[PDB]
C-alpha cells in the first residue's frame, strides 16, 4: 500500500502516480490539498 503514503510525502504528483483516480486519488490528494503548502 502506498496511495495514502504518497500524500504523506506531501506531493500532489505522488497521489497522481500512485492512486488510480475517482476516490483513490481523491482521499490522498484532498489530504495534500488541505495539508501541504501552498494549500494547507
UniProtKB/Swiss-Prot annotation:
What are the disulphide bonds in this sequence? Answer: 3-19, 10-36, 15-28
What GO terms fall under cellular component here? Answer: extracellular region; plasma membrane
Under which name does UniProt file this protein? Mating pheromone Er-1/Er-3
Its organism's taxonomic lineage begins at:
Eukaryota, Sar, Alveolata, Ciliophora, Intramacronucleata
Q: Name one GO molecular function term.
A: pheromone activity
Q: Which function does this protein serve?
A: Mating ciliate pheromones (or gamones) are diffusible extracellular communication signals that distinguish different intraspecific classes of cells commonly referred to as 'mating types'. They prepare the latter for conjugation by changing their cell surface properties. The membrane-bound form promotes inter-cellular communication and adhesion for mating pair formation and may act as binding site for the secreted form.
Q: Which UniProt keywords apply?
A: Cell membrane, Disulfide bond, Membrane, Pheromone, Secreted, Signal
**Subunit structure, per the record?**
Homodimer.
The reply on keyword Secreted is yes
Can you tell which superkingdom this protein's organism belongs to? Eukaryota
Amino acid at each position: 500500500d502506498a496511495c495514502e503514503q504518497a500524500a504523506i510525502q506531501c506531493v500532489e504528483s505522488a497521489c497522481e502516480s500512485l492512486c488510480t483516480e475517482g476516490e483513490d486519488r481523491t482521499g490522498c490528494y484532498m489530504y495534500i490539498y488541505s495539508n501541504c503548502p501552498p494549500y494547507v
